[PDB]
From a paper:
Contrasting with Enterobacteria, members of the dominant genus Bacteroides often encode several [name] vitamin B12 outer membrane transporters together with a conserved array of surface-exposed B12-binding lipoproteins. Here we show that the [name] transporters from [name] form stable, pedal bin-like complexes with surface-exposed [name] lipoprotein lids, which bind B12 with high affinities. Closing of the [name] lid following B12 capture causes destabilisation of the bound B12 by a conserved [name] extracellular loop, causing translocation of the vitamin to [name] and subsequent transport. We propose that [name]-dependent, lipoprotein-assisted small molecule uptake is a general feature of Bacteroides spp. that is important for the success of this genus in colonising the human gut.
Residue numbers in the entry: 26 to 355
The structure:
């Protein structure tokens, strides 16, 4: 007829969630093919004729449907992973963080500025319940990333909290907790069924705290801490990630750092050196073993991704949205 055929996502590509400026409404989604090395920006806007919203935080792909969590627009959009077109949405979310699917019929949505985890039925798009976290307020509340062991979801508590919680999905109740250093940022489960989390500093002039941050290996069966790796005061680490095998752990602390999940010690040498910039998100390809590093670079201008081989040679670098912070494989 007339207009050029719409953009489609063929193949085993990569969504990049760009946070945008908080309060400025300029969050965007990007898509990248590793084979083609072509990035498409603003795919949500261009597909739906509608701005993504305000702090685009995270994403999960589930049977060709992508669940994109817009933290500060109080929403999660279901999109086609082929078309990027909205197929449905979940609204009325305090300030969502991450979504974890127990089943098709039930998922948990963590929140900041709330003491509850929301329970939804993804097939109806409806809230089904709430999970009251102990010793938590609406004023300082924070749930974040999740992993499942058996019948249990574990979840780290970040902004002005110092805990990992343990939830029985049979009852949807918190049944156990573990205190760690302040503001654990992230959580992953390795091939040995050990969780890893890394704290940030707090910040200079926090009313909650400012201490030395730490990486923790934790057994999933027994919920006990096995190691701790303490770093410098004024470090502010973030975004722990695993490779596809779950035997190589990576995190951000000025540089990108890498450690085999086996072995008792933090390597001397990073995976990738500091650049007087703000490395901010991170992922590993489950096909290639390749490492993508999201640079926010000053948090103002258009950000960049940097792609490296498992063995540390630069493959590609490409411009995305403002403050890229998270990835999701298709
Ligand atoms: C830098 C930064 C960022 N932060 Co802070 C983080 N960590 N933050 C910080 C640091 C600021 C040090 C500094 N001034 O450089 C740091 C660690 C101290 C901080 C503090 C906080 N932050 C916090 C959070 C949760 C967030 N932060 C982001 C704004 C989050 C950003 C991510 C994002 N997508 O925006 C972020 C990575 C980039 C913001 C920025 O510097 N923009 C550059 C430039 C454009 O500045 P801007 O327009 O004026 O932005 C200002 C604000 O963002 C302010 N600010 C920073 N964080 C917050 C948080 C809140 C709640 C408010 C009202 C303002 C801020 O600092 C900037 C001053 O110019 C956030 C979007 C990150 C995320 N995606 O989860 C998220 C807020 C989302 C929400 N719904 O609340 C803390 C609650 C974390 C904590 N418990 O320690 C805390 C709040 C303290 C406060 N209100 O003063």
């Amino acid at each position: 007829h007339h207009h050029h055929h719409p953009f489609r996502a063929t193949g085993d590509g990569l969504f990049i969630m760009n946070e945008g400026n908080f309060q400025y409404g300029n969050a965007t989604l990007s898509y990248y093919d590793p084979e083609t090395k072509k990035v498409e920006n603003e795919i949500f806007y261009r597909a739906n004729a509608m701005k993504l919203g305000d702090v685009a935080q995270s994403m999960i792909v589930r049977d060709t449907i992508g669940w994109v969590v817009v933290n500060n627009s109080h929403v999660i959009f279901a999109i086609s992973t082929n078309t990027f077109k909205e197929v449905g949405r979940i609204t009325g979310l305090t300030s969502p963080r991450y979504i974890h699917f127990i089943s098709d019929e039930k998922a948990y949505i963590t929140q900041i500025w709330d003491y509850r985890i929301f329970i939804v039925n993804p097939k109806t798009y409806q809230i089904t319940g709430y999970i009251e976290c102990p010793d938590m307020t609406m004023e300082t509340g924070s749930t974040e990333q999740m992993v499942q062991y058996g019948k249990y979801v574990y979840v780290n508590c970040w902004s002005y909290q110092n805990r990992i919680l343990k939830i029985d999905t049979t009852t949807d109740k918190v049944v156990d907790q573990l205190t760690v250093g302040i503001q654990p940022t992230s959580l992953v489960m390795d091939k040995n069924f050990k969780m890893w989390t890394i704290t940030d500093g707090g910040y200079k002039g926090s009313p909650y705290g400012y201490e030395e941050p730490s990486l923790y290996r934790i057994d999933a069966e027994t919920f006990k801490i096995e190691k701790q790796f303490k770093f410098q005061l004024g470090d502010a680490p973030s975004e722990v990630q695993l490779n596809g095998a779950g035997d190589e752990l990576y995190w951000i602390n000025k540089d990108i750092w890498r450690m085999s999940v086996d072995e008792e010690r933090v390597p001397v040498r990073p995976f990738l050196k500091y650049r007087d910039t703000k490395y901010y998100g991170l992922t590993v390809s489950p096909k290639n073993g390749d490492v993508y590093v999201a640079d926010a670079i000053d948090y103002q201008q258009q950000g960049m991704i940097y792609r490296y081989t498992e063995d540390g040679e630069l493959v590609d670098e490409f411009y995305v949205g403002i403050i890229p912070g998270a990835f999701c494989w298709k």
